[PDB]
Design a protein around this ligand. Structure first.
Ligand SMILES: [Zn+2]
Length: 53
């Protein structure tokens, strides 16, 4: 189709509307559905205290 990488390639294929979105685009453009999972690992967490005894 087109030849000439302006910045950085990496288009992601949406799942909700199955539309083609560009990497630069934070979220979808067709359905506008958020893609950034932003999931939190089940890893443990404790109160942040003094690193040094
Ligand atoms: Zn979409």
């Amino acid at each position: 189709g087109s030849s000439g990488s302006s910045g950085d390639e990496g288009y992601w294929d949406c799942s909700v509307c199955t539309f083609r979105n560009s990497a630069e685009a934070f979220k979808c453009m067709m359905c506008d559905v958020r893609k950034g999972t932003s999931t939190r690992k089940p890893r443990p967490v404790s109160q942040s205290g003094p690193s040094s005894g």
